[PDB]
Amino acid sequence: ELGQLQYSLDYDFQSGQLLVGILQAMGLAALDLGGSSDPYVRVYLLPDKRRRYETKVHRQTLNPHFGETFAFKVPYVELGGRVLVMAVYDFDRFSRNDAIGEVRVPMSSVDLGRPVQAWRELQAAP
């Protein structure tokens, strides 16, 4: 049980940018021995691994409220070949940050004629 993430997708057709809102997560796995996590989300639009953004870290919670929005410049015609990755991590002070899980959204599975808001279960990295 890794939890789930609520996100929004909004394609701004005038600017040619995909707006990705990271709203909140719920029921996240605890990646600290004390039974909690310090969650943040790294967001990137595959296959571009260079343009990556990270939310603020939230302290000791498995139900973080993020309220972040990032965007990626991508022509609408190319969008179906992109895969959005929202990778949820647990920030640590004394060791590497820990993967909690990720949500992968093949953009071909979304219709962005109008904006969408959805929940998806976190999965282990492939």
Say whether residue 98 binds Ca ion (CB under 5 A).
yes
Burial label, 97 (beta-carbon count in 10 A; 0-12, 13-18, 19+):
middle
Q: Rounded to the nearest whole angstrom, what is the least distance from the CB of residue 120 to Ca ion in the complex? A: 23
Q: Choose the stretch contacting Ca ion; rule: CB under 5 A; options: 25-33, 64-72, 75-83, 111-119.
A: 25-33
Q: Which is nearer to Ca ion, 14 or 95 (CB)?
A: 95
The span from the CA of 92 to the CA of 50, in Å, is: 23
Secondary structure of the chain: what % helix, strand, coil (to 5)? 5, 50, 45
Q: Rounded to the nearest whole angstrom, what is the least distance from the CB of residue 96 to Ca ion in the complex? A: 5
Site for Ca ion in 36-55 (CB under 5 A): 38
90 annotated ligand binder: yes
